[PDB]
Amino acid sequence: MRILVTGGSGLVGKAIQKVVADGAGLPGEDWVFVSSKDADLTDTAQTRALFEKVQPTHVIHLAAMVGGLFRNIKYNLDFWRKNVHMNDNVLHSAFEVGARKVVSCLSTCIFPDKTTYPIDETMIHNGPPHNSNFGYSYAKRMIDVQNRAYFQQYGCTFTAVIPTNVFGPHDNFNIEDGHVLPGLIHKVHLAKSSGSALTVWGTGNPRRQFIYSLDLAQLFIWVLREYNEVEPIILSVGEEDEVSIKEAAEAVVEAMDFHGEVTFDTTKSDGQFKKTASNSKLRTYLPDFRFTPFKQAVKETCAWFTDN
């Protein structure tokens, strides 16, 4: 086996890198983690050269333009164009090199805005996504479209995984361009240093399902090894384990032991209020998989941010 992991220097990439190094890589597996320095995946010639030099049997595609709510609201053309180029170059290069399996990465924010809850793997194209991230959403939706096209025309086992809001070490902690959990971890840290209050953006009422990067890294390694379906699989925590932004901010405030004031910038966008996903397909395959308790995983992430 030869596994080429694209975008291996990111949050999910370093998590798979840490899990494999901690004793998860089965004998006869060659793990090749690449970044933009190895090949700019928007460039067709650079990607073809990487897939030709590193001839893989299996591919974990993570390379993408990823940003927070406020980054997506700003650059939907960039999120659409840059991702479509990266996805087409990786999927078609893996096809011409003859890769046995390609597991791409999707998101729960790509799902239709007007839908029934909980969301499942069959509802992926049943209506338009949220207006804030339509660019990124459609780029990831077209991965599934391409996966179906390779499978129906050539028999390729090109599949995808649908994780929820991931968090953990080697995250983007830029408050402006980052997500809710790493953006609040840096906020509380600056508030402790400056002696200022914590300003949570929005109302704190939107509900989100969070997944620890290390947990999704273990599920990703399983998906590449035993999940033979072409249809995607939601890699998330249960519907009941959904929390609000207020609750998530409370977990960060407790983990960083912040005793200062917590205010809410009601004027800021809340984005999509809900995107409750059902992990029924995951629970039919892995009913014995145990997730890291949210408070323990937040504390571990907070400790890593203050340490590194």
Ligand SMILES: NC(=O)c1ccc[n+]([C@@H]2O[C@H](COP(=O)([O-])OP(=O)(O)OC[C@H]3O[C@@H](n4cnc5c(N)ncnc54)[C@H](OP(=O)(O)O)[C@@H]3O)[C@@H](O)[C@H]2O)c1
């Ligand atoms: N984080 C979440 O909450 C979340 C939720 C759902 C889905 N996901 C999925 O998770 C995957 C990984 O995202 P992440 O959260 O780990 O973000 P990340 O930390 O920013 O990692 C993105 C990776 O992509 C690489 N990359 C960017 N442009 C590239 C290019 N042109 N060519 C090659 N590599 C390139 C980056 O390398 P450099 O630093 O070298 O540029 C980096 O290693 C994405 O496919 C995303 O859809 C994440």
Ligand SMILES: Nc1nc2c(ncn2[C@@H]2O[C@H](COP(=O)(O)OP(=O)(O)O)[C@@H](O)[C@H]2O)c(=O)[nH]1
């Ligand atoms: N990005 C970000 N969102 C925050 C922050 N504090 C609170 N939020 C809330 O988190 C949500 C956006 O989360 P984000 O991970 O960026 O993206 P989303 O899950 O796709 O909507 C909104 O409801 C915001 O009001 C922060 O510091 N950064």
